[PDB]
Symmetry: C2
Subunit: 121 residues, 2 copies
Amino acid sequence: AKAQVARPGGDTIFGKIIRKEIPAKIIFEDDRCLAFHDISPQAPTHFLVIPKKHISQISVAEDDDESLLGHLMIVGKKCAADLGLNKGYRMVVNEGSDGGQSVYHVHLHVLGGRQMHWPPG
Amino acid sequence: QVARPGGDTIFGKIIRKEIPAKIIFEDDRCLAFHDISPQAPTHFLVIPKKHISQISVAEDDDESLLGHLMIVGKKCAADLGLNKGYRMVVNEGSDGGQSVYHVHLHVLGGRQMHWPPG
């Protein structure tokens, strides 16, 4: 076990979801982001908020992306209220291998509907 | 008993330098410092100076400030040597595990983080 190949700037399944080429349960859309239920949910409610812009990893985000990344969080909290997560929730961004990043397209996880535990992985 | 949402927190003491903390970064909008109950070899918080009690009550105009928390987070992670990655967390309410009602972004790294994230 050794060989690896990666294309961080390349297309991902989340690109395909944004382009509507493959289905997803869409919760919210606007001109700059998409919110949809996770296909491998880890809580009774688990959705993602992703930018339309392909920022591959938060580690390579630019200063001028601050509004957009904040917009993910605002959209995430609004969607959580509309889905009834009034007892609370956890927001998560994963970076790289130690962070458990599954897809090279920045994504904010929102999890709720159960007690979330500590440490957060 | 019960610090209620809207009440001051320990973070006010850390901002005013009334208790010791290992401060990583400070600007006019936010402060980053190491967590005193770390859950990974690197574990730090990024907090706004504006008192936002809970992410559920952030206003629309707080967008750029919340974004700024993530940008400072990622800068600080790079400066602390987290070249293999890290995990960012914001908790809301009881199910989120929050009791300290001031918005705070966790950054954890220096070990493999697992799934699910709690």
